[PDB]
Each structure stands twice: as structure tokens, then as C-alpha cells.
Design a protein around this motif. Structure first.
Motif, PDB file in Angstrom:
ATOM      1  N   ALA A  78       7.277 -35.854  40.040  1.00  0.00           N
ATOM      2  CA  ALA A  78       6.206 -35.903  39.044  1.00  0.00           C
ATOM      3  C   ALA A  78       4.925 -35.452  39.753  1.00  0.00           C
ATOM      4  O   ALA A  78       4.119 -36.274  40.185  1.00  0.00           O
ATOM      5  CB  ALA A  78       6.057 -37.282  38.442  1.00  0.00           C
ATOM      6  N   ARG A  89       1.336 -33.083  39.800  1.00  0.00           N
ATOM      7  CA  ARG A  89       0.338 -32.563  38.883  1.00  0.00           C
ATOM      8  C   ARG A  89      -0.529 -31.553  39.616  1.00  0.00           C
ATOM      9  O   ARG A  89      -0.807 -31.713  40.807  1.00  0.00           O
ATOM     10  CB  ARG A  89      -0.498 -33.693  38.281  1.00  0.00           C
ATOM     11  N   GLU A 110       7.270 -27.822  46.959  1.00  0.00           N
ATOM     12  CA  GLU A 110       8.196 -28.814  46.432  1.00  0.00           C
ATOM     13  C   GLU A 110       9.484 -28.166  45.943  1.00  0.00           C
ATOM     14  O   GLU A 110      10.508 -28.837  45.779  1.00  0.00           O
ATOM     15  CB  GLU A 110       7.512 -29.600  45.325  1.00  0.00           C
ATOM     16  N   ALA A 170      -2.447 -42.151  34.103  1.00  0.00           N
ATOM     17  CA  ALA A 170      -1.359 -42.888  34.738  1.00  0.00           C
ATOM     18  C   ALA A 170      -0.294 -43.427  33.774  1.00  0.00           C
ATOM     19  O   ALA A 170       0.892 -43.360  34.141  1.00  0.00           O
ATOM     20  CB  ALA A 170      -1.940 -44.008  35.615  1.00  0.00           C
ATOM     21  N   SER A 203       4.128 -42.097  33.422  1.00  0.00           N
ATOM     22  CA  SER A 203       5.269 -43.005  33.446  1.00  0.00           C
ATOM     23  C   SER A 203       6.249 -42.696  32.323  1.00  0.00           C
ATOM     24  O   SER A 203       7.464 -42.830  32.501  1.00  0.00           O
ATOM     25  CB  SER A 203       4.790 -44.451  33.349  1.00  0.00           C
ATOM     26  N   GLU A 248       8.351 -39.306  33.260  1.00  0.00           N
ATOM     27  CA  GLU A 248       9.385 -39.402  34.281  1.00  0.00           C
ATOM     28  C   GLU A 248      10.519 -40.324  33.849  1.00  0.00           C
ATOM     29  O   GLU A 248      11.629 -40.244  34.388  1.00  0.00           O
ATOM     30  CB  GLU A 248       8.778 -39.884  35.594  1.00  0.00           C
ATOM     31  N   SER A 249      10.268 -41.199  32.875  1.00  0.00           N
ATOM     32  CA  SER A 249      11.280 -42.178  32.499  1.00  0.00           C
ATOM     33  C   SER A 249      12.333 -41.565  31.586  1.00  0.00           C
ATOM     34  O   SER A 249      13.529 -41.829  31.749  1.00  0.00           O
ATOM     35  CB  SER A 249      10.626 -43.379  31.826  1.00  0.00           C
ATOM     36  N   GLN A 284      12.831 -40.005  38.460  1.00  0.00           N
ATOM     37  CA  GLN A 284      12.519 -40.986  39.489  1.00  0.00           C
ATOM     38  C   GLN A 284      13.793 -41.638  40.011  1.00  0.00           C
ATOM     39  O   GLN A 284      14.850 -41.569  39.379  1.00  0.00           O
ATOM     40  CB  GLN A 284      11.572 -42.046  38.933  1.00  0.00           C
ATOM     41  N   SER A 293       6.927 -46.424  55.239  1.00  0.00           N
ATOM     42  CA  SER A 293       5.914 -47.431  54.964  1.00  0.00           C
ATOM     43  C   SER A 293       6.285 -48.751  55.625  1.00  0.00           C
ATOM     44  O   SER A 293       7.463 -49.058  55.827  1.00  0.00           O
ATOM     45  CB  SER A 293       5.735 -47.628  53.459  1.00  0.00           C
ATOM     46  N   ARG A 323       1.782 -44.933  44.383  1.00  0.00           N
ATOM     47  CA  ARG A 323       2.150 -43.577  44.758  1.00  0.00           C
ATOM     48  C   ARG A 323       0.962 -42.645  44.587  1.00  0.00           C
ATOM     49  O   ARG A 323       0.154 -42.804  43.672  1.00  0.00           O
ATOM     50  CB  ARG A 323       3.321 -43.075  43.912  1.00  0.00           C
ATOM     51  N   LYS A 349      -1.022 -39.448  43.542  1.00  0.00           N
ATOM     52  CA  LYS A 349      -0.997 -38.313  42.635  1.00  0.00           C
ATOM     53  C   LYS A 349      -1.229 -37.033  43.425  1.00  0.00           C
ATOM     54  O   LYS A 349      -2.069 -37.007  44.333  1.00  0.00           O
ATOM     55  CB  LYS A 349      -2.051 -38.495  41.547  1.00  0.00           C
ATOM     56  N   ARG A 362       2.749 -37.345  45.776  1.00  0.00           N
ATOM     57  CA  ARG A 362       4.025 -38.000  45.441  1.00  0.00           C
ATOM     58  C   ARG A 362       4.584 -38.737  46.665  1.00  0.00           C
ATOM     59  O   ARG A 362       5.678 -38.466  47.164  1.00  0.00           O
ATOM     60  CB  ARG A 362       5.021 -36.989  44.840  1.00  0.00           C
ATOM     61  N   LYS A 409       4.605 -42.745  48.501  1.00  0.00           N
ATOM     62  CA  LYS A 409       4.315 -44.172  48.410  1.00  0.00           C
ATOM     63  C   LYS A 409       3.342 -44.542  49.518  1.00  0.00           C
ATOM     64  O   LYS A 409       3.727 -44.711  50.676  1.00  0.00           O
ATOM     65  CB  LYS A 409       5.601 -44.982  48.503  1.00  0.00           C
ATOM     66  N   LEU A 410       2.062 -44.652  49.163  1.00  0.00           N
ATOM     67  CA  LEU A 410       1.048 -44.968  50.160  1.00  0.00           C
ATOM     68  C   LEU A 410       1.078 -46.444  50.524  1.00  0.00           C
ATOM     69  O   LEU A 410       0.950 -46.799  51.700  1.00  0.00           O
ATOM     70  CB  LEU A 410      -0.333 -44.580  49.642  1.00  0.00           C
ATOM     71  N   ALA A 411       1.245 -47.316  49.534  1.00  0.00           N
ATOM     72  CA  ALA A 411       1.245 -48.751  49.771  1.00  0.00           C
ATOM     73  C   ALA A 411       2.200 -49.424  48.800  1.00  0.00           C
ATOM     74  O   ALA A 411       2.279 -49.042  47.630  1.00  0.00           O
ATOM     75  CB  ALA A 411      -0.160 -49.343  49.622  1.00  0.00           C
ATOM     76  N   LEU A 412       2.920 -50.423  49.296  1.00  0.00           N
ATOM     77  CA  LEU A 412       3.801 -51.240  48.474  1.00  0.00           C
ATOM     78  C   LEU A 412       3.020 -52.425  47.917  1.00  0.00           C
ATOM     79  O   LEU A 412       1.788 -52.468  47.949  1.00  0.00           O
ATOM     80  CB  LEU A 412       5.004 -51.721  49.285  1.00  0.00           C
ATOM     81  N   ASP A 447      -2.312 -43.715  41.685  1.00  0.00           N
ATOM     82  CA  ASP A 447      -1.886 -44.574  40.590  1.00  0.00           C
ATOM     83  C   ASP A 447      -0.789 -45.534  41.035  1.00  0.00           C
ATOM     84  O   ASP A 447      -0.168 -45.362  42.087  1.00  0.00           O
ATOM     85  CB  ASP A 447      -1.431 -43.756  39.363  1.00  0.00           C
ATOM     86  N   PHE A 475       2.703 -47.560  40.294  1.00  0.00           N
ATOM     87  CA  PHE A 475       3.985 -47.583  39.609  1.00  0.00           C
ATOM     88  C   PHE A 475       4.720 -48.883  39.904  1.00  0.00           C
ATOM     89  O   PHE A 475       4.546 -49.467  40.977  1.00  0.00           O
ATOM     90  CB  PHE A 475       4.883 -46.415  40.038  1.00  0.00           C
ATOM     91  N   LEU A 528       7.989 -50.622  41.170  1.00  0.00           N
ATOM     92  CA  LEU A 528       9.113 -50.251  42.020  1.00  0.00           C
ATOM     93  C   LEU A 528      10.439 -50.691  41.421  1.00  0.00           C
ATOM     94  O   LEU A 528      11.493 -50.192  41.822  1.00  0.00           O
ATOM     95  CB  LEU A 528       8.908 -50.838  43.424  1.00  0.00           C
ATOM     96  N   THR A 556      12.820 -49.181  34.865  1.00  0.00           N
ATOM     97  CA  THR A 556      11.883 -48.600  33.917  1.00  0.00           C
ATOM     98  C   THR A 556      11.446 -49.628  32.875  1.00  0.00           C
ATOM     99  O   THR A 556      11.995 -50.730  32.772  1.00  0.00           O
ATOM    100  CB  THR A 556      12.498 -47.382  33.227  1.00  0.00           C
TER     101      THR A 556
END
Lengths: 51, 147, 234, 132, 128
Positions: C2, C4, C41, C212, C216, C219-220, C225, C230, E7, E9, E12, E14-17, E118, E120, E122, E125
RNA sequence: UUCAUCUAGACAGCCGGACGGUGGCCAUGGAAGUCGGAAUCCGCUAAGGAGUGUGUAACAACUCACCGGCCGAAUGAACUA
């Protein structure tokens, strides 16, 4: 990030001046009269505004 | 390796303000730093100011109170603006409180080294009514006791 | 997944690009910031072709194609036609189509399996779309609109449709397309959902002003996804 | 707000009543000014294919009338020169209505739309069924 | 609740959980900290009064694993960092302050602006 | 024109010191003489004010106050046309 020893090196040219009230010129801070002729070499000076 | 000397002030229970900024050039530690300074201020009030210096090497803990400043005369008391205008019986204990204070004072004996620590005490009641100015000007006790 | 980005300062990408599972087309008058969004990508899995159609930069609205074929309008010159035969692989087939309804992107809404076309299209084209693309062709309209290209984005997984759409018309479409359909908006509330974004299985690129909660929903339904880098080192 | 467009001949002065191409309820549009026009003594400002104009409804739905709102020319009867060589011209003038950002209120456009109008505005090219 | 991810924008990543987030939620609302004060050069002269915003437009998180080379290599007292694939101004690090747009203060902390990133979930859906 | 300083060493400039209890104390994201309120003490001293300002997120750094010498005859102020 500015390293304030270098800021005091820079503020002498930009901040630490004076301004004539009549002709708005940028004068050295210990000056007594304006060096221009259009304001008649007046003695009405002010410190330049700090930040 | 190397030795890095730092400083710290204030706090009661746990303090994390000025200290975290000096730990930027050092290693990253939050729970290791504010707990090591907590044992230094252990059995000290959170109302009172506590000065420390911490020398560390590879995530190390140091705890010492120098007690050169008004940390001493704050300690021999009981806990919009809390006034420190209290009465304490200093002259008996301030003879011994100066002994911890005068480690270098760099003065002639304790006769002049107790006349400065009382001068730092510019708030509390001290001995009897007042423990300042002319009430604590001339000493006739100890003097040749400490030296 | 996803991503942009935006062309020159315009959020809408489906006017300016055409994304399938085997190839990709982009307009030529772009910055390096727009082309790097696709090339990084996609990589070298599918060929990315800088091209123009009929002397324009609106190739997402003038072309229509999928995995097996690509259709170009009548005003496409033979310099632009012989160029696309070389850059795209041999598996795709390109055939020029004589139309009165020239803009093939707004007319044909298609994917690998089922195509929806404009209701005013003729019998000579419908025999050609099922020949080149190899797709069964169904003439059907989104509830209030005759242009199915700009108001219905379609893929192999699912499909996003027009926001002002009645529910029982979506259910008749979903039985026909055999994919689940969600009504929604893109690009901070633009009702044009076919041109606001592009889509295939691995990627779906939309505008920068897409908020935002809108990302969602996209992608759903398309199910694109699905992370050891991390962690805390204090 | 308008991108670069090659100069084509000016064919719609102030006061021209052109048709309304979309299905937003209006029937005709009355051009009163052109965005980005110039200034000269006694010169009327004029529109061309692809310009943004201010236009009012003179006939159509009663909600749309008696207010000014921007609009986009999509057809033109005065012939213009394309760079590839051919002189072309449509049959009648036409205009679709839009917000000042450039997004179109209409759902679909009947008839053909000029090609230089489609490249200049993205939202017009989405609604366009036939591009020349 | 469930675990969430922030995540980036256009990167794409995952910067932080979750298991983060020093969220500091209530402001002060009083006249010294809940308001933005602009002083002057001399004598505590206040020229401007500003009201704080509604929601805190930063994220106050832990120094993470991918932040490690930027925080060790040329370690400084203030600066910024990026996504690992797009090099955009994502969030800055500051050992001073920068309260929240809405205001409290924090700590020497790692602020992460809610623009151009933004949040999301984890988990699975939403399934409307 | 009317005062005033000065070989009993001026104004200007230079060269020195400007420490110790000190990040004193309440105060707050953080205020170490310098965002602020009342306090204003001591010690070493030839002399150095819990500090005149510049600076710092807070320090620092530097000057002024103050204490000594270096150069060695003019100088500061108000007015009149």
C-alpha cells in the motif's frame, strides 16, 4: 547543532548592531551618529531588537 | 577505557530531568540511571535538594553525596512555597556537622570552618532562638576540639 | 503493498499509469520522484515502460488491458504502436481497436477473469475483447453511472466501487463478478475510485492525499496485507 | 491552478452562451470572465478550449441558477491549429462545471471532448467517454 | 485491545510497534503550561497568548533497534532521522523537550510526528 | 563663552588578579551572581558585590565592580553663532 560559540561569532555581524530612528540604517553598536547624509547625521539611535 | 565525571542535583524519590540530557553522549540507559541515583537519595527526603556526582564506565553506577553545600544543614532537620524558617539546636551538632563539612574548607582549623557553615544556614532556627548573625558570630566552644 | 505517491502535483494515478500482473505503463513527463515509487517496489520482475498514447499523457484512461493483452485506441500513431511491441514481452498481444468511444480506460473495466464494458458498445468490439484479452464480456453499469472504468477498480481478489451505490446493486454485481465488493472513497473523499488508484496482486498505489482510514479499506478488500528488524535496544 | 497549454485561437468572448455538456442539471452556461486573461483598453477577454471560466446557469435546474461558479470549456467551433498539422473544429461549444480546485461535479460527459482539454485537467479525462 | 503498528506512509515500514508509547495523555489546562507563551527580550514581557491544540501530534516512544546507527554515529544533542527507504523527515530526536501540539512537556524523548505516518492494527482486519 | 579633571601620573588603551562555603535558599520542564521575590551572611584577602552586563535548554565563556603595576600631557561637560 548550532554550537553557540559559533553563534556569538555570527551575532556580531547580524544582531549586535544599532538602528537609526530616522533613516532605519544598520549602524555599529557603539556609534553616536548615523553615517548617512539623508538624515542629517542625527544622534537618535536605538539598539537593534534582540530575539 | 576512560573515566567520565558528571553531576546531579535536586530530587527526592526519583528525578529524571537534567540528568537524562547529560546521558546523551553517554550510553543509553533510563531505568538503570534513575534507580542508581535512587539508592544515593535513599533515606533522604523528596522535599529536600540532594546533590550527587556520578562517575561511570560502560553502564556503571556511582553514588556519593559530597555534602559541601547546604546539604548538611538540611539533613539535621525533620520534614505555594515551603518556608525553611525553622528552629534547630545547631551549636551542639553543628560542631560535628562542620567536621563532615570541613574536609578542605581550606581555613585555619574548625573555628573559622564552623563560622561559614552557619553562614550558609540562612533560614533555620539553629541553637535556641536564632542561629544566625550575631547569635552565631563569636564561638566560645570546641575550637581546639577538632584540631 | 500500500504505497502512495503523486504525479507532478496531481494525486490521481490511474489517469497516468496502467498496472497489470505482467507489465506496467507510465507517462513520460514525470519527475524522478514518481518513477522511483514504482521501480523500487516492483524491481525487475515486470517491465516498466515510459510511453505515450495518441500524443497524450493520459494513458491510464486511453488504454485497457490485462495479463494476456493490451488494447490501444485508433489515434495511437504507429511510432507509439511499434514502440510498445518491443518493450513489452512476447506473451502480451496488442491490437488497435476502431471505436467511436475512443477512451478505452473509462469504457472497459477488466481483469484476468471478468470484464465489464460500457453499455453503448457494439457487437464488433465485444467479439474482439473476448479474442485478445480472452475474457468473457458483460455489459453492466454501476447504479447511476455508465462509465465503469473511472468508478470501479477491479482486481483478481476483490473490487472497490463507487461510494454512492445502493446495496442490492452491489450484490447483483458481486454474484456476476464473483468477487467481494466494498463501496468507499479515495484521496480524502474523491468519488472517482477507478482513476484514483491502481491495483494488482502485489501492489496498490494511491494518491498522497489518501487519508489513513481510506488506506485501510483498500488493502483489506484486496487482501494485500499480511519484522524482526524492530525491537528495543536501550 | 492551470498548467501549461499551447496557445490556440480565442473563440468565446464574454457573453457567449455555450451548451452544457454534463448531466449536472444545467442546460447552458453564460461566460462572464476567463481565469488568467489579460488587460487592454476596450478588449474583451476571451476563452479557448481548455480554459477555466466563470459561468452562470441561464436555463436548467432552479437550484443552480442565480449564482456564479467556475466552469471548463470542452468543445469549440472556432478552428484551431494543432502542432501535428491539421486544423480542426467541433460543431458547437460546450462547458462542464467544476469547483475552483478543478474537480468536476458531473458524473459523465455526453459527446466528444477536445484532446488539449483532456491533458490539461485530470478529472475531465476521467469523466470523458470520447476523447476526439 | 489488540497490538498495533505505526507503519510509514510511502516507505511501508513498521517504524514502531505497541509496547511503547509514553502517551502522557492529559494536558495541564492551566495558564503556564496549557498555553503557549511568547516572551520578549527583556523583563518577562509577554506579547502572544496561544491556546493548545486538541490531540497530541507526536509519538513518544523508546529508542528502537533501527534507530541505533543514527544515534551512535555522530551522536548530538538534537536532530532528526528518516524511514530506512525514502529519507524523508519522519521524526526528530530531541534531548530537550518539545511538549506536544496540545502541550505538556515530556522527557528527553523521541518525538514522531503524526503527519506522514499512520497507525495500523497488527491484528486481523476490521471486517465491517 | 562658562565650569571641571590633570606630573601629588588624568581620559583612552594595554598588560594582571577577579577566589573560597557555591549549582546558597524557597520557585519550575529546566533558572549555577544574569526568567523572578524577600532576604544580603561568612571565609581567605593587596582586593573580588550570594554580582554589572553579554551569552547558555541549564552551564560555560567573558566583562564591569574591586585590587596592583605599564605607557606620560592634555582632557571631560554644557552652551553661543
Amino acid at each position: 547543532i548550532i554550537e553557540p560559540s559559533l553563534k556569538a561569532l555570527a551575532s556580531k555581524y547580524n544582531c549586535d548592531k544599532s538602528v537609526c530612528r530616522k533613516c532605519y540604517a544598520r549602524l555599529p553598536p557603539r556609534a553616536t551618529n548615523c553615517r548617512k547624509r539623508k538624515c542629517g547625521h542625527t544622534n537618535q539611535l536605538r539598539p537593534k531588537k534582540k530575539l | 577505557x576512560x573515566x567520565x565525571x558528571x553531576x546531579x542535583x535536586x530530587x527526592x524519590x526519583x528525578x529524571x530531568x537534567x540528568x537524562x540530557x547529560x546521558x546523551x553522549x553517554x550510553x543509553x540507559x533510563x531505568x538503570x540511571x534513575x534507580x542508581x541515583x535512587x539508592x544515593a537519595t535513599k533515606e533522604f527526603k523528596g522535599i529536600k535538594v540532594t546533590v550527587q556526582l556520578k562517575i561511570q564506565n560502560r553502564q556503571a553506577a556511582a553514588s556519593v553525596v559530597p555534602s559541601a553545600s547546604s546539604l548538611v544543614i538540611t539533613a539535621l532537620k525533620e520534614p505555594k512555597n515551603v518556608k525553611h524558617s525553622g528552629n534547630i539546636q545547631l551549636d551542639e551538632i553543628i560542631x560535628x556537622x562542620x567536621x563532615x563539612x570541613x574536609x578542605x574548607x581550606x581555613x585555619x582549623x574548625x573555628x573559622x570552618x564552623x563560622x561559614x557553615x552557619x553562614x550558609x544556614x540562612x533560614x533555620x532556627x539553629x541553637x535556641x532562638x536564632x542561629x544566625x548573625x550575631x547569635x552565631x558570630x563569636x564561638x566560645x566552644x570546641x575550637x581546639x576540639x577538632x584540631x | 503493498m500500500a504505497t502512495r505517491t503523486q504525479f507532478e502535483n496531481s494525486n490521481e494515478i490511474g489517469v497516468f499509469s496502467k498496472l497489470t500482473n505482467t507489465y506496467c505503463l507510465v507517462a513520460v513527463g514525470g519527475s524522478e520522484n514518481f518513477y522511483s515509487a514504482f521501480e523500487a517496489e516492483l524491481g525487475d520482475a515486470i517491465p516498466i515502460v515510459h510511453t505515450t498514447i495518441a500524443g497524450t499523457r493520459i494513458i491510464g484512461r486511453m488504454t485497457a488491458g490485462n495479463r494476456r493483452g493490451l488494447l490501444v485506441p485508433t489515434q495511437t500513431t504507429d511510432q507509439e504502436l511499434q514502440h510498445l511491441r518491443n518493450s513489452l514481452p512476447d506473451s502480451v498481444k496488442i491490437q488497435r481497436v476502431e471505436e467511436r468511444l475512443s477512451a478505452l480506460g473509462n469504457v472497459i473495466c477488466c481483469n484476468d477473469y471478468v470484464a465489464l464494458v460500457h453499455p453503448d458498445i457494439d457487437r464488433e468490439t465485444e467479439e474482439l475483447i473476448s479474442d485478445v484479452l480472452g475474457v468473457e464480456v458483460f455489459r453492466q453499469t454501476i447504479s447511476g453511472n455508465i462509465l465503469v472504468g473511472s468508478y470501479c477498480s477491479l482486481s483478481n481478489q476483490g473490487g472497490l466501487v463507487h461510494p454512492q451505490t445502493s446495496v442490492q446493486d452491489q450484490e447483483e454485481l458481486s454474484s456476476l463478478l464473483q468477487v467481494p465488493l466494498v463501496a468507499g472513497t479515495v484521496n480524502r473523499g474523491s468519488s472517482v475510485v477507478g482513476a484514483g488508484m491502481v491495483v494488482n496482486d502485489y501492489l496498490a498505489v494511491t494518491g498522497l492525499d489518501t487519508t489513513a482510514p481510506e488506506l485501510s479499506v483498500i488493502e483489506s478488500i484486496f487482501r494485500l496485507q499480511d519484522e524482526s528488524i524492530s525491537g528495543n535496544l536501550r | 491552478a492551470q498548467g501549461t497549454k499551447f496557445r490556440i485561437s480565442l473563440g468565446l468572448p464574454v457573453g457567449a452562451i455555450m451548451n452544457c455538456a454534463d448531466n449536472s442539471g444545467a442546460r447552458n452556461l453564460y461566460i462572464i470572465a476567463v481565469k488568467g486573461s489579460g488587460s487592454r483598453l476596450n478588449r474583451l477577454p476571451a476563452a479557448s478550449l481548455g480554459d477555466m471560466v466563470m459561468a452562470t446557469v441561464k436555463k436548467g435546474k432552479p437550484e443552480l441558477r442565480k449564482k456564479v461558479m467556475p466552469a471548463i470549456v470542452v468543445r469549440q467551433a472556432k478552428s484551431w491549429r494543432r502542432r501535428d498539422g491539421v486544423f480542426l473544429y467541433f460543431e458547437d461549444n460546450a462547458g462542464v462545471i467544476a469547483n475552483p480546485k478543478g474537480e468536476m461535479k458531473g458524473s459523465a460527459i455526453t459527446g466528444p471532448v477536445g484532446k488539449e482539454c483532456a491533458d490539461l485537467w485530470p478529472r475531465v479525462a476521467s469523466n470523458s467517454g470520447v476523447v476526439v | 485491545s489488540k497490538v498495533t503498528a505505526v507503519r510509514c506512509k510511502k516507505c511501508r515500514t513498521k517504524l514502531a510497534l505497541s509496547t511503547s508509547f509514553i502517551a502522557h495523555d492529559p494536558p495541564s489546562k492551566e495558564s503556564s503550561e496549557g498555553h503557549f507563551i511568547k516572551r520578549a527580550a527583556n523583563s518577562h514581557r509577554i506579547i502572544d497568548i496561544q491556546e493548545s491544540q486538541a490531540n497530541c501530534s507526536h509519538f513518544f516512544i523508546e529508542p528502537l533497534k533501527w534507530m541505533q546507527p543514527e544515534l551512535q554515529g555522530k551522536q548530538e544533542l538534537e536532530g532528526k532521522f528518516s524511514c530506512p527507504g525514502c529519507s524523508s523527515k519522519v521524526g526528530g530526536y530531541n534531548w530537550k523537550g518539545s511538549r506536544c501540539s496540545c502541550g505538556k512537556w515530556v522527557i528527553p524523548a523521541i518525538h514522531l510526528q503524526t503527519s506522514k505516518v499512520d497507525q495500523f492494527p497488527l491484528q486481523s482486519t476490521a471486517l465491517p
